Amino acid sequence: SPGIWQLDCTHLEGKVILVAVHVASGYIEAEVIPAETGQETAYFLLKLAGRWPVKTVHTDNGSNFTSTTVKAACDWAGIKQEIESMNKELKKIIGQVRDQAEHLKTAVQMAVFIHNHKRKGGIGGYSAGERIVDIIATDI
Amino acid sequence: SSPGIWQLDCTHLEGKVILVAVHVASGYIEAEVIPAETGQETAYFLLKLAGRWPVKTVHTDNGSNFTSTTVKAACDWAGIKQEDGIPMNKELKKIIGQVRDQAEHLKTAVQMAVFIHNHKRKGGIGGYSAGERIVDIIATD
Ligand SMILES: OCc1cccc2c1OCCO2
Ligand SMILES: [Cl-]
Numbered sequence: 713s714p715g716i717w718q719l720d721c722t723h724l725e726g727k728v729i730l731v732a733v734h735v736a737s738g739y740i741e742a743e744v745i746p747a748e749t750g751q752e753t754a755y756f757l758l759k760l761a762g763r764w765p766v767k768t769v770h771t772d773n774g775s776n777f778t779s780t781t782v783k784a785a786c787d788w789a790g791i792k793q794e795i796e797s798m799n800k801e802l803k804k805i806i807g808q809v810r811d812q813a814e815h816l817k818t819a820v821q822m823a824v825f826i827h828n829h830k831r832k833g834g835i836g837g838y839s840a841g842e843r844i845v846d847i848i849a850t851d852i
Numbered sequence: 853s854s855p856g857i858w859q860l861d862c863t864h865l866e867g868k869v870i871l872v873a874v875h876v877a878s879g880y881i882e883a884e885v886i887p888a889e890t891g892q893e894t895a896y897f898l899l900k901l902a903g904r905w906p907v908k909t910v911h912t913d914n915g916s917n918f919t920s921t922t923v924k925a926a927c928d929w930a931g932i933k934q935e936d937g938i939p940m941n942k943e944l945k946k947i948i949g950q951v952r953d954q955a956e957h958l959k960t961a962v963q964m965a966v967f968i969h970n971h972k973r974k975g976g977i978g979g980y981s982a983g984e985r986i987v988d989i990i991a992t993d
Contacts, residue, residue, distance in 0.1 A: 763882065822899065
């Protein structure tokens with residue numbers, strides 16, 4: 713359903729990459745953070761929800777997600793708190809481009825760009841960015 | 853007003869710089885507090901924006917950050933056409949003021965304001981938000 717996202721962390725170069733996947737489309741948002749703190753997580757969730765209509769997020773077990781800053785952000789934004797493949801693709805691409813830039817955070821945004829624009833399938837296929845927008849637009 | 857066209861503008865507040873991109877056809881906004889209007893910060897903001905929405909053309913204020921070759925390079929790589937100097941933000945500073953006392957730091961208040969802006973129904977109860985308008989305009993199927 714159009715409002716559901718899943719969030720995962722990937723540790724790399726001594727930093728964390730926070731990755732949200734829009735489950736129905738495979739579309740991705742990601743950010744590089746210093747550590748998976750409650751405040752970082754809350755801020756990331758607030759940005760996501762101000763850009764897309766987030767109803768529910770699926771997370772893992774981390775103490776970041778139960779922090780009071782994350783609960784305050786979720787209450788304010790209206791988010792209920794509770795792919796392997798899209799993530800495996802993502803880290804794959806960061807791998808294939810990491811060399812083209814100094815900072816991890818540059819290579820990560822380049823990987824997001826490449827993931828979200830890439831057409832899947834044949835001549836009549838769609839990119840993840842197209843799928844998420846088509847899904848949401850249809851929902852109304 | 854076509855679908856790939858964004859306008860980028862700077863606002864200065866509490867001695868901080870806010871970079872704002874507006875999708876001209878819908879009024880939808882993306883915004884971030886950045887350290888200063890450097891080429892590298894500008895390039896990175898644009899790269900993030902264009903990986904999330906299909907950005908074909910950007911209208912900028914022709915600031916020295918946009919004329920740098922590091923912005924030019926980011927635009928070439930992303931397939932974005934720069935129109936430098938070619939031709940509600942006071943409502944943003946307003947919304948920022950309406951949420952400012954629920955957040956210690958300006959950057960959090962900015963993202964709250966971005967959220968209120970893109971959710972707001974414009975034109976009475978019969979109308980649509982900027983978030984509904986951008987998806988409507990941009991969807992290919
Ligand atoms: O895709 C964006 C979108 C689609 C529908 C509603 C929205 C919205 O953005 C932020 C809030 O409201
Ligand atoms: Cl600017």
